[PDB]
C-alpha cells in the first residue's frame, strides 16, 4: 500500500529472474528465464545438447 512505488509494467524492472531472483543477469526473451549463470548448472534436464 503505502511506501511501495514502481508500477513495474515497463522494461526489465521488475519482471526478472524466474531462476535466481537476481535482477541483473537475466536471459528472458524466448521463454527461458534462467539467469544464465544459472544455466550451465541447469542445462539438464532441459534438452540442449551442443552440436557445433
Amino acid at each position: 500500500t503505502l511506501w511501495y512505488s514502481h508500477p513495474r509494467k515497463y522494461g526489465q524492472g521488475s519482471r526478472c529472474c524466474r531462476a535466481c531472483s537476481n535482477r541483473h543477469g537475466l536471459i528472458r526473451k524466448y521463454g527461458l528465464n534462467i539467469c544464465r549463470q544459472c544455466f550451465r548448472e541447469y542445462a539438464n534436464d532441459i534438452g540442449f545438447k551442443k552440436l557445433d
Binding site: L32, Q37, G47, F48, K49, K50, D52
Partner: protein, 102 residues
C-alpha cells in the same frame, strides 16, 4: 456425416519418431484408416548463445547450444467411432498426440 480427423504428432527423439511408424500406422492401415503416409514437417531448431563464463574475463568467447524437435503428421479420412483405440495404444515417452473434439 464422415469425419476427416487430421492428427499432428511430434517428439524430440527421432527414434521414437521412427518407433511410431513401426507400430501405430500399420495397426490402422490394416482396417483402411487412410493414413496418407508419414507427413514429416521441418524441425524447430533453436540456438541460444551467451557468455559461458560467470565473470567472463579472458579470451572471452561464447558457448553454442542446439535443439532439434521433429514432427510427423498422421491425417485420416475416417469418423470418430474408429479412432479412440489408437489413442490408447501404443503410447510412447515424449510423443504428443493432438486430436480435436470441440
Amino acid at each position: 456425416s464422415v469425419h476427416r480427423i487430421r492428427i499432428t504428432l511430434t517428439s524430440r527423439n527421432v527414434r521414437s519418431l521412427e518407433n511410431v511408424c513401426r507400430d501405430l500406422i500399420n495397426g490402422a492401415k490394416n482396417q483402411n484408416l487412410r493414413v496418407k503416409g508419414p507427413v514429416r514437417m521441418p524441425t524447430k531448431t533453436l540456438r541460444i548463445t551467451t557468455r559461458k563464463t560467470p565473470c567472463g574475463e579472458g579470451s572471452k568467447t561464447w558457448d553454442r547450444f542446439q535443439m532439434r524437435i521433429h514432427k510427423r503428421i498422421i491425417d485420416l479420412h475416417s469418423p470418430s467411432e474408429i479412432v479412440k483405440k489408437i489413442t490408447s495404444i501404443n503410447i510412447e515417452p515424449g510423443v504428443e498426440v493432438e486430436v480435436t473434439i470441440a
